[PDB]
Amino acid sequence: TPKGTIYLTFDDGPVNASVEVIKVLNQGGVKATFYFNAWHLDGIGDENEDRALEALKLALDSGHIVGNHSYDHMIHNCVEEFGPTSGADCNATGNHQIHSYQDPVRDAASFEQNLITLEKYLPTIRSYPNYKGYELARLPYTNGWRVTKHFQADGLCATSDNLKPWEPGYVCDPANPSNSVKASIQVQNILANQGYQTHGWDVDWAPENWGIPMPANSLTEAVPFLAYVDKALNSCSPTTIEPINSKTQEFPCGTPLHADKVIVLTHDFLFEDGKRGMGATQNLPKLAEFIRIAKEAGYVFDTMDNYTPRWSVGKTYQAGEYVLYQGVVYKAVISHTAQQDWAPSSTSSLWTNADPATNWTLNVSYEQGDIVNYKGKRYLVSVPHVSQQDWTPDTQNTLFTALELR
Q: Which long-range contacts (CB under 8 A, 24 or more apart) does 310-316 make?
A: 311/338, 311/343, 311/344, 312/338, 313/338, 313/339, 313/340, 314/338
Footprint of Zn ion on 7-36 (CB under 5 A): 11-12
Nearer to a second copy, 134 or 251 (CB): 134
Nearer to Ca ion, 195 or 243 (CB): 195
Print the binding letters for residues 347-386 with a second copy: x by CB under 8 A, - otherwise.
xxxx--------xx------------xxxxx---------
Cis before 243? omega within 30? yes
Q: Which of Ca ion, a second copy, Zn ion, none has residue 116 at its interface (CB below 5 to 8 Å by kind)?
A: a second copy
Residue 283: closest CA among 269, 267, 271, 265: 271
Give the chain's end-to-end CA distance (angstroms, integer).
Answer: 54
Do residues 28 and 292 make contact, with C-beta atoms less than 8 angstroms apart?
yes
State the alpha helices, DSSP H only, in 43-94: 52-61, 86-93
Do residues 15 and 46 make contact, with C-beta atoms less than 8 angstroms apart?
no
Which distant-in-sequence residues (6+ apart) come within 8 Å of 397 by Cβ?
none
Letter string b/e over residues 173-188, b meaning 16 or more CB atoms within 10 A of that residue's CB: eeeebbebbbbbbebb
Do residues 340 and 44 make contact, with C-beta atoms less than 8 angstroms apart?
no
Nearer to a second copy, 122 or 270 (CB): 122
Q: Which of Zn ion, Ca ion, a second copy, none has residue 327 at its interface (CB below 5 to 8 Å by kind)?
A: Ca ion
Footprint of Zn ion on 137-176 (CB under 5 A): 140
Q: How far is the CB of 174 from Ca ion (least distance, A)?
A: 28
Q: Using the rule CB under 5 A, give the single segment among 185-193, 311-319, 327-335, 392-400 that binds Ca ion.
A: 327-335
Q: Using the rule CB under 5 A, give the single segment among 176-184, 192-200, 230-238, 269-277 that binds Ca ion.
A: 192-200
Nearer to Ca ion, 195 or 320 (CB): 195
Among 1, 80, 127, 404, binds a second copy (CB under 8 A): 127
Among 50, 54, 61, 208, binds a second copy (CB under 8 A): 61
Indicate the pairing of strand 4-11 with strand 33-36: parallel
Q: How far is the CB of 367 from Ca ion (least distance, A)?
A: 21
> Is residue 102 near a second copy by the rule CB under 8 A?
no
Q: Using the rule CB under 5 A, give the single segment among 156-164, 193-201, 210-218, 297-305 that binds Ca ion.
A: 193-201
Do residues 357 and 151 make contact, with C-beta atoms less than 8 angstroms apart?
no
> Is residue 311 near Ca ion by the rule CB under 5 A?
no
> Is residue 195 near Ca ion by the rule CB under 5 A?
yes
> Is residue 327 near Ca ion by the rule CB under 5 A?
yes
Residue 159: closest CA among 143, 175, 146: 143
- Angle, in degrees to the nearest 10, between helices 279-296 and 222-232: 50
Report helix, strand or coil for 328: strand
Question: What are the residues binding a second copy (CB under 8 A)?
Answer: 57, 60-61, 105-106, 109, 112-113, 115-116, 119-120, 122-124, 126-128, 190, 193-194, 313, 326, 340-343, 345-350, 359-360, 373-377
Contact residues toward Ca ion (CB under 5 A) are 195, 327
List of residues contacting Zn ion (CB under 5 A): 11-12, 140
